[PDB]
Design a protein around this ligand. Structure first.
Ligand SMILES: *[C@@H]1O[C@H](CO)[C@@H](O[C@@H]2O[C@H](CO)[C@@H](O[C@@H]3O[C@H](CO)[C@@H](O)[C@H](O)[C@@H]3O)[C@H](O)[C@H]2NC(C)=O)[C@H](O)[C@H]1NC(C)=O
Ligand SMILES: *[C@@H]1O[C@H](CO)[C@@H](O[C@@H]2O[C@H](CO)[C@@H](O[C@@H]3O[C@H](CO)[C@@H](O)[C@H](O)[C@@H]3O)[C@H](O)[C@H]2NC(C)=O)[C@H](O)[C@H]1NC(C)=O
Ligand SMILES: *[C@@H]1O[C@H](CO)[C@@H](O[C@@H]2O[C@H](CO)[C@@H](O)[C@H](O)[C@H]2NC(C)=O)[C@H](O)[C@H]1NC(C)=O
Ligand SMILES: *[C@@H]1O[C@H](CO)[C@@H](O[C@@H]2O[C@H](CO)[C@@H](O)[C@H](O)[C@H]2NC(C)=O)[C@H](O)[C@H]1NC(C)=O
Ligand SMILES: *[C@@H]1O[C@H](CO)[C@@H](O)[C@H](O)[C@H]1NC(C)=O
Ligand SMILES: *[C@@H]1O[C@H](CO)[C@@H](O)[C@H](O)[C@H]1NC(C)=O
Length: 1873
């Protein structure tokens, strides 16, 4: 068992080693791909980011100073690793380092304690004034001293002063403002801003807010009140001008009172020193503070100058205030127009629409929520370049980031949308409520944990199977091609029938093909591990996975190899079939979430899908910081993924299923590869081979293939078997061997049945089929070694058998060369010798001389002479002339039944015609007849043709005395008879064999009409093929049109409603601080009610919230540590050095116990989170929520989006109440101005001081991944505030605010973008119609190629067919074939009503484009027919090249034209649109331009278009059409020029031809010379021949003689280098058409069409030869009648027998009556009845008066059919004469055979040598003798004849036979030597 196993393994290894190029490329193919992958990975290393925190952001509702402070400081959004002060529950602002806050606090704390001083001063002044109609001075002095001392202890004043006295260097004003915080003057400010890029970008972001223009469409007084309430903040802001002008008016007055009022001031100051002196050092320090004698110090002048400078700076800052940025518009359309006009000068900011519920103008929305007032709806319109897009909510590809980038994602902040929303909401709540609520809103972004960003892992998981499949496609194709090639040549059948079993072959193939896959897998695992692609993973698991996949793919390849039956077809189709199974993985991964878990296992049946699922599981497990390892082989990383063990099990199950399916399907072909006149009494009775009434019945044929055969064979005799094809000979051979079991009868061989003995009869059996059994890569030595080893011979003595056989076959010199496919013809003798290696007693041969050269034929025959002893041999060969030489006994079968059998002596050849007496001439028939009758009455006259006379001598009464007297008289008369020659031949076995077989301008118009009919019939006969190759390509795109519009077309962004409920179920916060206030409780209750919670009764409300239970281990961990509700969580690990993780993972004890929660009616979850950080909790608990959606990473649904914290008051001491008291005391008492110039200012200062309480605040935590969370939560907060402030009642339910979002429709550049720069559906349609239409043009070359490889085209050309007409007809038929799919696709476009292809202006463009596309694309495929030799591979290559060039050119030019950045891309595409040439690229450009222009017309016709945009314009599609139509005929011209690129008797006949030419002689040859290139010797050199037309000429020769060269030169196949060959007086060189018009050519090649029938060919030829239409039918009838064809009339010519092909070729040649008919090898292995019809037809045609020249190997026919023969060797004639003279001249002597029952040589040889002087002998055997009498005997043969008549009495002789020098005497001479 093992022996054949490793023999097969060694044979496969020998195959593999002999093709180094394939092995090297197979090894090196995936290495480059994985090197590319490794380089790609090396390009982008992973990134790491630490834990991140963000600062707070205020809003204008909170205040003015904090809002601007935030706007200025938090421009940059720097991430903070530590905690920020704003997130703690207590603090709100984080700007104590800010100078402004310190200044405000200092001012408040100083003015708080100064009330007593100012009040005392005021009351003193008033009492002094009242008494007008010293102690107050002292009190005022002390108060001023105290205030001066207090203001001295204020550093912030010192820093601000030091800031003021500085030059104007550095950068500009805003940098100084930022340092202090964190109109030509305006023109200079803008210039300074543009001076520095930082200030440049700051001003770019800030300017639209400053210089905007707010608008509102409705103009009712309600909206006017709303707008006034809106800009109340702007009204308050523009107050600095009032104080500026107040200072500007007051300063001059006090200044005038300051200087030149010096005497008076000195007077009071001198008065006030002695006031304190006589009542200390504190006073003069106060005096120095006043600086009354101020020269060294600086108080007054500098204070005045600095106050003026600061006021001027503030005025300059406020100079460019917008002042009035609020306008109104009457209508929405007018609003849009005015907004666009403002956008023209960069003035527009945002438009507001107060859409009312009563208006009912709501697209896709309810007109109103309910009847009655109290509902307000607001739209905000802004430029699309600012507001975020409004088409999708969540990102389509999850990223592991916090999404904090102010330029890209944070658009609502620097666009000002939130500011306007907050202002409008505050105005609306103020107007609706009727009160003045206060709530400072703050925005806080939730923190994000430390993470690692790596884009490579997801694409790796999505792309690894693709790389593996493209890596192993080559190996799959090679394996399937090798298997199919082996199974095609039936060698597997020989191995199975010769002793092997199916299991051994399958295991050998498996273990042969499992090597390279495992080697590649090992190399890939090594490069993956060492390439850092999959780090931290143990290689063993990956290697096992890859090995399982390799096993699955190799068994899948074996399964795939069970469909095809052609080598190259299988090689081409296997790769496509295997790659086509990978798409379902892509389809599944696209719809990953949709598919249920039930279908996953079902889809995993295909190997690539299972591998992809395993790969994604491996990648997901890799991302968790630990690759594949033994720790977690059987653990599922996620709830809905597969562990690797399940994947491996599924792979092995699939492999087993595929193997079993292949084993079952191997039986799809059962078996198919897709009269008693006898004698049994030999002298040696050795029944070695015997069959007794065998029976078998094939399923296809109801009649049994072979009937009962009771004949038995005998050892020691070379028995011969004769029969017809399909007459049971093949069935008998199959049954005798092990191919099929014996169905009936007995087949006992050597006493044991073949079926009973099984393998025990193999050691002594010999089978040699007609098909060769050889291996191309091996050589003869290992061939015989392998065969001897497999047959069971011991390897010890295999060497002697090997060398003995190789020396016996005479291949000693040719075995050391070690070449198999480098030799031809010789291999037959080696193949037949292989059957003799085992020394089997019984050997079977089937056609051992099928096509071998005669010069070696005797060779193999000699081998049979070497093994004619001690062995039984049974040969079954169709021919007869070889059978007689080796025939000890002969058996005959006919119709699956034995007819006769016996021995070739008279016991079998019972024929009346005994001997044939031939008389030749160089006189008179009556005289010869009278002489013959006188000598012997017995004589028959059968032949009387001129120059010969054949008589028949009856066998009965063969009295040799009378014949001897007759021939002696002839010897005494032949001298004067002028005959000078005669002969007596015996009965040829052919005639007796047959007898016993039946004993038991209009011309070319009709030519092209015929060609069109032929093409139409050929196309129509393949019904399924034509439908498949026409209907399918059109309907593919036809049905793909409707399904290609998945991608939505671009359009206006829809109006979106903003609300938290639009996301779904989620988790929110309502954390609260300082609950000691009824208003805060009311606000919290309003928030709870708005969240969707119902107020329960108090008894149930007591337990309205429930705390989830804590696990025991978590509680134990918390208790073990020291954890408080505020204290930090236990811990949480991070990314270790090297061991990176996507997200931190730490135990559930982190974050504390689960907080109490409740569930609302809408599925929302609310959580009560007071008493914590509320920050560390979020950081710890974030990844747990997201981990669920991490499996697919496509549309991740987070739970936490936002939350509220009710921060109340602010820890600090502003004490603004006493500030208001001081301000009102100053206003009422000091300087009461009735005009209000100061009174209104003091009023607003009092209002600000009293409003400084800031009763409460509210912080909103938002998650930025949700795109519209910010505005939704702001709206919810505003609605909750209004609900809280509203009184209880029904109106609470009926009052609400709705905020929407609706960007302005479009501008021009957005049109340019969204009209064509997407074009996804249009591009897909264009490329799809590019691919689908490309298959048709390559389909036409199949027919041309298959006619070119066959000699059918050549046979057609030897008619009257000109190449021009042929090519034109092919082109026209291709037009007719192509016309249908174009109509189908155009009707499809009409059916789907595509807008771009339905208008009256664009339809002709498409029609002409498609039609002319086909017209100009068909001729390009024609030139490819010549080079290629295989149809399917040529079709595949042409289709691939067409698709490649088309898609590459089109997509390259497309991607170049869009996304243009630099002028270099502009020029190149222009050239890429000028080079043209390719019709594929032309069609692509035309269609894509059509669709682009239609799209731009559709976009522009919505607006004012004013452009015709004609599709038919010259510069649009016209140039392509013109260029391609004018180049169309160029391909036809080039291909036609490529096709037409080609531009002693021997001596006496030579002299006769040289001296002149005969007019009657049709064939005249002069200087016949053919010189071969590179062979150093011409094939034929200087011959000549003159063939008369009234007789039939025959030419003969050995291989290499050059006869085929002569035939091809006469035909015209070979270029006529030199020589004259003229037929019928018409020269081939002068006019080849005239020579070929009347030539009837019949080659050995079966140039036939499978679909076409014989009668179709005959009718086609007849109508090509000018036969009238009516006479064509009768000509076809006569042509079939002269060959029969009654049973084959309707059958196609392809499905005929072997001889029927040649007979129909002869019929085709003879039809039309050509001047000369040439036949090359017309009789090669057919039934003798076909030969009978053939010689009948040829005698008829030669009698008709036409010349026929025939050349073949069997010349006996020519002896029996023609009257002139010529032998030629190596281009030199040898005989060239009349056939009888040829035998008389060179064939020389005569031979004699004797058959003696005693089988003793001497008694016969004595008088045989006595009769003639010669003593030549050959093959001296008892069965048959051969004696060569002296050649050229002058006397008659009668000298023996009568003598023989006596010697029958001397010795017992069975019979004597004489061979009187026939034509095959040359073959006898060759056999002898
Ligand atoms: C809320 O939880 C946070 C922790 O999530 C508490 O703040 C943390 O306080 C510790 C104690 O100082 C900080 O540890 C420090 O780490 C630095 C790192 O270099 C180290 O140099 C110091 O010696 C110290 O060990 C920790 O950084 C800090 N957390 C953050 C994010 O900065 C906070 O106290 C909790 N709130 C409470 C208790 O009210
Ligand atoms: C931006 O898009 C809006 C919305 O499509 C455009 O408003 C639309 O303008 C057209 C005028 O070109 C209006 O068509 C009119 O319809 C009435 C019937 O309601 C008909 O009687 C008129 O004869 C005219 O056909 C259309 O109603 C109006 N609205 C919609 C929803 O289509 C707007 O014009 C676009 N921007 C610009 C600058 O055009
Ligand atoms: C707020 O809006 C109102 C009306 O829309 C403005 O009232 C007028 O504003 C212009 C220029 O701003 C003044 O010239 C008029 O005298 C104002 N008339 C009245 C009756 O007030 C108001 O000015 C706007 N507020 C601001 C700061 O511009
Ligand atoms: C606050 O200052 C304003 C001046 O800017 C005082 O006068 C008001 O001015 C606006 C327009 O600027 C008018 O529409 C109002 O009618 C004016 N009077 C009032 C009472 O608002 C305003 O009086 C000052 N505030 C207080 C409380 O006196
Ligand atoms: C903004 O922050 C980035 C990143 O830290 C820094 O490089 C840049 O200088 C900052 N720019 C400004 C204007 O603050
Ligand atoms: C004030 O008056 C004095 C008187 O000599 C004069 O010199 C001075 O220029 C005036 N202005 C100021 C600002 O001192």
């Amino acid at each position: 068992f093992w022996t054949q196993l490793m023999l097969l393994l060694w044979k496969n290894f020998m195959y593999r080693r002999r093709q180094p190029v394939q092995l090297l490329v197979e090894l090196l193919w995936p290495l480059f791909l994985f090197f590319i992958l490794v380089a790609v990975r090396h390009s982008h290393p992973p990134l790491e980011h630490h834990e991140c925190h963000f600062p707070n952001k205020p809003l204008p509702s909170a205040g003015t100073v904090p809002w601007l402070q935030g706007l200025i400081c938090n421009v940059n959004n720097t991430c903070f690793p530590q905690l920020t002060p704003g997130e703690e529950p207590g603090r709100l602002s984080n700007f104590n380092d800010s100078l402004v806050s310190r200044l405000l606090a200092d001012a408040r704390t100083v003015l708080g304690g100064a009330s007593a001083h100012r009040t005392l001063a005021g009351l003193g002044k008033l009492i002094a004034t009242l008494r007008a109609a010293q102690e107050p001075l002292h009190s005022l002095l002390e108060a001023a001293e105290d205030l001066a001392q207090e203001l001295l202890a204020l550093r912030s004043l010192v820093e601000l002063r030091a800031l003021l006295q500085r030059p104007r260097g550095t950068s500009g004003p805003l940098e100084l403002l930022s340092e202090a915080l964190c109109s030509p003057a305006c023109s200079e400010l803008i210039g300074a801003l543009d001076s520095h890029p930082l200030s440049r970008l700051l001003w770019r972001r800030l300017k639209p807010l400053i210089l905007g223009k707010l608008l509102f469409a409705p103009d009712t007084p309600f909206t006017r009140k709303l707008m006034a309430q809106v800009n109340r903040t702007f009204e308050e802001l523009t107050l600095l001008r009032d104080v500026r002008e107040v200072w500007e008016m007051l300063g001059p007055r006090i200044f005038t009172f300051m200087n030149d009022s010096s005497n008076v001031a000195m007077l009071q100051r001198l008065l006030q020193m002695q006031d304190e002196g006589r009542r200390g050092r504190d006073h003069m320090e106060a005096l120095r503070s006043f600086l009354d004698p101020g020269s060294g110090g600086y108080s007054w002048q500098d204070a005045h100058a600095d106050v003026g400078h600061l006021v001027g700076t503030l005025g300059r800052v406020t100079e460019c205030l917008s002042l009035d940025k609020l306008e109104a518009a009457p209508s929405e359309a007018a609003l849009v127009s005015r907004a666009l006009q403002l956008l023209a000068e960069h003035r527009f900011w945002a438009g507001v629409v107060f859409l009312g519920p009563e208006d009912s103008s709501d697209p896709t929305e309810h007109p109103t929520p309910d009847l009655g007032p109290g509902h307000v709806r607001i739209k905000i319109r802004m430029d699309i370049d600012v507001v975020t897009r409004t088409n999708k909510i969540r990102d389509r590809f999850w990223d592991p980031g916090p999404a904090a980038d102010p330029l890209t994602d944070l658009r609502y902040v620097w666009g000002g949308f939130v500011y306007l929303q907050d202002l409008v909401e505050r105005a609306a709540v103020r107007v609706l409520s009727g009160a003045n609520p206060r709530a400072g809103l703050y925005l806080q972004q939730m923190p994000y944990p430390c993470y690692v960003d790596d884009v490579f892992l997801r694409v790796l998981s999505r792309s690894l199977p693709l790389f593996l499949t493209l890596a192993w496609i080559y190996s799959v194709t090679l394996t399937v091609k090798a298997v199919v090639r082996e199974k095609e040549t039936r060698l597997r059948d020989t191995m199975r029938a010769m002793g092997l079993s199916r299991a051994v072959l399958w295991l050998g193939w498996f273990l042969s093909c499992l090597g390279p896959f495992l080697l590649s897998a090992a190399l890939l695992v090594l490069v993956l591990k060492l390439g850092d692609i999959l780090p931290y993973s143990h290689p063993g698991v990956v290697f096992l996975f890859l090995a399982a996949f390799a096993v699955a793919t190799v068994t899948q390849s074996f399964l795939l190899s069970a469909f095809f039956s052609r080598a190259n077809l299988a090689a081409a189709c296997g790769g496509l079939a295997y790659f086509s199974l990978y798409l379902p993985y892509v389809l599944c991964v696209a719809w990953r979430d949709r598919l249920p878990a039930g279908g996953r296992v079902a889809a995993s049946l295909l190997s690539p899908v299972a591998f992809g699922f395993g790969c994604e599981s491996l990648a997901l497990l890799e991302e968790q910081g630990e690759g594949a390892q033994w720790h977690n082989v059987g653990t599922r990383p996620t709830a809905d993924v597969f562990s690797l063990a399940q994947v491996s099990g599924l792979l092995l199950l699939d492999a087993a299923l595929y193997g079993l399916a292949t084993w079952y399907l191997e039986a799809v072909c059962p078996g198919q590869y897709g009269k008693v006149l006898v004698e049994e009494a030999p002298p040696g009775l050795s029944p070695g081979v015997s069959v007794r009434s065998l029976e078998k019945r094939f399923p296809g044929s109801p009649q049994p293939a072979l009937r009962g055969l009771s004949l038995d064979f005998y050892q020691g005799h070379i028995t011969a078997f004769l029969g017809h094809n399909g007459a049971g000979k093949t069935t008998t051979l199959s049954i005798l061997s092990g191919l099929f079991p014996p169905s009936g009868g007995s087949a006992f061989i050597l006493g044991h049945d073949v079926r009973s003995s099984m393998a025990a009869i193999r050691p002594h059996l010999g089978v040699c089929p007609q098909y060769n059994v050889l291996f191309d890569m091996l050589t003869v030595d290992e061939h015989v070694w392998f065969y001897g080893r497999l047959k069971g011979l011991s390897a010890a003595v295999v060497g002697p058998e090997q060398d003995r056989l190789l020396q016996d076959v005479g291949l000693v010199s040719k075995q050391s060369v070690q070449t198999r496919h480098l030799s031809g013809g010789m291999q037959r003798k080696l193949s037949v010798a292989i059957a003799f290696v085992g020394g089997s007693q019984v050997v079977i041969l089937d056609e051992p001389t099928a096509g071998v050269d005669p010069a070696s034929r005797r060779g193999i025959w000699e081998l049979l002479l070497k093994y004619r002893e001690g062995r039984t041999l049974i040969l079954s060969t169709h021919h007869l002339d070889e059978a007689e030489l080796l025939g000890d006994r002969v058996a005959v079968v006919a119709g699956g039944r034995l007819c006769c059998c016996g021995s070739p002596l008279f016991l079998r050849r019972h024929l009346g015609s005994g001997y044939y007496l031939t008389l030749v001439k160089a006189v008179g028939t009556p005289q010869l007849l009278a002489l013959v009758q006188h000598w012997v009455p017995g004589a028959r006259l059968v032949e009387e043709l001129p120059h010969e006379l054949v008589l028949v001598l009856p066998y009965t009464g063969a009295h040799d005395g009378s014949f001897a007297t007759l021939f002696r008289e002839l010897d005494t008369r032949l001298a004067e008879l002028r005959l000078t020659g005669y002969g007596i031949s015996d009965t040829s076995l052919e005639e007796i064999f047959l007898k016993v077989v039946e004993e038991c301008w209009a011309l070319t118009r009709q030519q092209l009409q015929a060609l069109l009919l032929k093409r139409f019939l050929l196309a129509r006969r393949s019904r399924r093929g034509l439908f498949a190759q026409i209907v399918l390509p059109a309907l593919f795109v036809g049905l793909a049109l409707v399904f290609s519009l998945i991608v939505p077309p671009f359009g206006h962004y829809p109006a979106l409603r903003l609300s938290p409920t639009m996301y779904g179920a989620q988790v929110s916060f309502f954390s609260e601080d300082a609950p000691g206030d009824p208003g805060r409780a009311r606000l919290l209750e309003a928030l709870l009610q708005e969240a969707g919670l119902e107020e329960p009764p108090v008894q149930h409300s007591s337990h309205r919230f429930s705390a989830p239970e804590v696990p025991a281990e978590v509680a134990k961990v918390l208790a073990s540590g020291n954890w408080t509700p505020e204290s930090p969580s236990p811990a949480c690990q991070c990314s270790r050095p090297g061991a990176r993780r996507l997200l931190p993972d730490c135990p559930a004890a982190a974050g504390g116990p689960p907080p109490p929660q409740a569930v609302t009616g809408s599925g929302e979850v609310v959580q009560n989170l007071t008493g914590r950080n509320l920050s560390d909790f979020l950081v710890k608990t974030y990844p747990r929520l997201v981990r669920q959606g991490l499996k697919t990473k496509k549309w991740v649904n987070e739970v936490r989006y936002g939350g509220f914290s009710l921060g109340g008051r602010d820890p600090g001491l502003p004490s603004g109440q006493e500030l208001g008291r001081s301000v009102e005391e100053l206003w009422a008492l000091l300087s009461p101005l009735p005009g209000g110039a100061l009174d209104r200012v003091l009023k607003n200062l009092t209002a600000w001081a009293h409003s400084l309480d800031a009763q409460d605040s509210l912080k909103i935590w938002f998650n930025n991944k949700g795109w519209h969370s910010m505005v939704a939560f702001v709206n919810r907060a505003s609605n909750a505030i209004l609900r809280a402030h509203l009184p209880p009642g029904p109106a609470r339910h009926a009052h609400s605010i709705t905020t929407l979002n609706h960007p302005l429709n479009l501008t021009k550049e957005q049109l340019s973008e969204g009209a064509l720069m997407a074009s996804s559906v249009d591009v897909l349609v264009s490329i799809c119609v590019v691919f689908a239409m490309s298959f048709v043009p390559a389909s036409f070359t199949l027919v041309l190629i298959e006619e070119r490889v066959t000699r059918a085209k050549h046979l057609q050309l030897m008619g009257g067919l000109s190449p021009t007409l042929y090519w034109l007809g092919n082109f026209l038929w291709d037009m007719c074939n192509y016309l249908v799919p174009a109509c189908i696709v155009v009707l499809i476009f009409l059916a789907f009503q595509q807008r771009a292809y339905v208008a009256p202006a664009n339809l002709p463009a498409l029609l002409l484009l498609l039609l002319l596309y086909g017209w100009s694309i068909t001729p390009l495929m024609y030139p490819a027919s010549f080079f290629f030799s295989v149809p399917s591979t040529a079709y595949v290559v042409l289709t691939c090249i067409n698709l490649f060039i088309g898609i590459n050119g089109s997509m390259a030019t497309f991607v170049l034209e869009l996304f243009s950045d630099q002028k270099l891309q502009e020029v190149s595409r222009i050239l890429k649109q000028v080079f043209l040439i390719f019709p594929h690229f032309c069609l692509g450009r035309g269609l894509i331009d059509m669709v682009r222009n239609q799209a731009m017309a559709d976009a522009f016709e919505r607006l004012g278009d004013r452009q015709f945009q004609s599709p038919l314009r010259w510069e649009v599609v016209g140039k392509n059409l013109l260029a391609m139509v004018i180049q169309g005929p160029l391909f036809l011209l080039f291909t036609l020029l490529l096709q037409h690129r080609s531009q002693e008797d021997v001596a006496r006949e030579r002299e006769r031809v040289v001296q002149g030419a005969t007019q009657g002689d049709v064939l005249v040859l002069r200087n016949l010379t053919k010189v071969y290139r590179g062979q150093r010797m011409p094939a034929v050199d200087r011959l000549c021949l003159g063939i008369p037309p009234g007789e039939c000429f025959g030419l003969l020769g050995v291989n290499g003689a050059g006869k085929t060269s002569t035939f091809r030169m006469v035909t015209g196949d070979t270029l006529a280098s030199r020589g004259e060959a003229v037929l019928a007086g018409h020269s081939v060189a002068r006019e080849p058409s005239a020579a070929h018009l009347s030539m009837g050519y019949c080659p050995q090649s079966d140039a036939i069409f499978e679909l076409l029938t014989g009668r179709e060919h005959l009718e086609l030829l007849a109508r090509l030869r000018g036969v009238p239409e009516a006479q064509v039918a009768q000509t076809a009838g006569s042509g079939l009648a002269r060959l029969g064809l009654s049973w084959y009339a309707d059958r196609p010519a392809g499905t005929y027998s072997g001889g029927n092909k040649r007979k129909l070729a002869t019929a085709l040649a003879l039809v039309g009556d050509p001047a000369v008919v040439f036949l090359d090898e017309p009789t090669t292995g057919m039934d003798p009845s076909a030969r009978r019809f053939l010689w009948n037809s040829l005698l008829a045609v030669v009698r008709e008066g036409r010349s026929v020249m025939l050349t073949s190997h069997s010349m006996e026919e020519c002896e029996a059919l023609c009257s002139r023969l010529a032998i030629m060797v190596n281009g030199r004639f040898r005989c060239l004469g009349s056939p009888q003279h040829l035998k008389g001249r060179f064939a020389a002597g005569h031979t004699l055979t004797l058959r003696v029952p005693a089988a003793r040589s001497q008694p016969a040889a004595a008088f045989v040598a006595a009769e003639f002087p010669g003593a030549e002998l050959r093959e001296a055997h008892g069965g048959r003798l051969r004696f060569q009498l002296p050649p050229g005997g002058r006397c008659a043969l009668a000298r023996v004849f009568g003598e023989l008549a006596v010697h029958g009495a001397e010795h017992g002789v069975e019979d004597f036979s004489v061979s009187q020098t026939m034509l095959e005497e040359v073959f006898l001479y060759f056999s002898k030597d």
